[PDB]
Paper text:
Strigolactones (SLs) and karrikins (KARs) are two classes of structurally related molecules that mediate signaling pathways to stimulate seed germination. SL and KAR have been reported to be recognized by the homologous proteins D14 (DWARF14)14–17 and HTL (HYPOSENSITIVE TO LIGHT; also known as KAI2, KARRIKIN INSENSITIVE2), respectively. To elucidate the structural basis of ligand specificity, we determined the crystal structures of ShHTL1, ShHTL4, ShHTL7, and ShD14 and compared their structures with those reported for ShHTL331 and ShHTL529. All the structures were highly similar to one another, consisting of a canonical α/β hydrolase domain and a helical cap.
ShD14 showed a high sequence conservation with other angiosperms D14 (e.g., sequence identity of 75% with AtD14 and OsD14) and maintained one D14 copy in Striga as in other nonparasitic plants, which strongly suggested that ShD14 had a conserved function with D14 from other angiosperms. In contrast, although only one D14 ortholog, ShD14, has been found in Striga, it showed no enzymatic activity toward Yoshimulactone Green (YLG), a fluorogenic SL agonist that becomes fluorescent when it is hydrolyzed by AtD14 or some HTL enzymes, despite possessing conserved catalytic triad residues. Here, we also demonstrated the hydrolytic activity of ShD14 toward rac-GR24 and 5DS, despite the demonstration of no hydrolytic activity toward YLG in a previous study. ShD14 was able to hydrolyze rac-GR24 and 5DS but not YLG, suggesting that ShD14 might also serve as an SL receptor. ShD14 and OsD14 have bulky residues in their pockets, such as F125ShD14/F176OsD14, W154ShD14/W205OsD14, and F194ShD14/F245OsD14 (corresponding to residues 124, 153, and 194 in ShHTLs), making their pockets smaller than those of the divergent clade. However, these differences between ShD14 and ShHTL7 did not seem to influence their hydrolytic activity toward rac-GR24. In contrast, the corresponding residue of L142 in the D14 group was the highly conserved V143ShD14, which avoids such steric hindrance. Moreover, the transcripts of ShD14 remained unchanged during the conditioning and germination process of Striga seeds;28 therefore, it was likely that ShD14 did not function in germination.
Residue numbers in the entry: 0, 4 to 265
The structure:
Amino acid sequence: SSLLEALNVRVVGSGEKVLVLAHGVGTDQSAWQRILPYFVRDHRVVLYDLVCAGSVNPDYFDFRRYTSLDAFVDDLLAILDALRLGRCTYVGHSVSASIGILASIRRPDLFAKLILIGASPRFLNDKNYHGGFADGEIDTVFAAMEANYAAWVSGFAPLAVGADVPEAVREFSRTLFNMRPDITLFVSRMVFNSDLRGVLGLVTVPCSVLQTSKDHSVPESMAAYLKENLGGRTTVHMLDIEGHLPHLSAPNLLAQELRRALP
């Protein structure tokens, strides 16, 4: 159950151009805090928290509804329809890249462009498809998270940040610790098992695939896979930034690439 205030939707900035900044699992909209300065001067920047963000009242997280990314797409589309700001450029990091992809195929009218950071249509390896994870790989990760959430965060946040950026590890550790562990585990499992490869061809809006350097969850070959399989006009931008969270670890460089990717 996700309302406009429930997901902490905020519109900051000025300008007719609308930018949507959509964070991934483990953080909230504060993940974008350092990127906002680069766009509020000429964008009305739409931010919101995924239902799973620690900044959202966990009672709003319905376990029987959020069994697929589609319910997340419902929230995103409900927000853009609630805001009624019209055509917008959507920036989706990780799961929010998948959410934006699925949202654009339902409502291509809403999105002038998709900017996809840390995007993967499927983490599991498959037939000639390398997602980056074998069958047994993620089990130990979900095990550590359920067994000792704090020890898991202490390891996962520096891995997710990648580069030695203590402020990024701090911010990501914080938002991870703000999430109820059963929600983190449930969403991470749901998101990890999602497979969007079959709908990439249905995308019609153009996409910018911002591929980050050393992503524990996204191989570099994923950028080319998304280019080949996304159905719209797709440009790949291989980020110099290392790590799954370039918006946290190198916001100025990321913002530069983000600005360049805008329509």
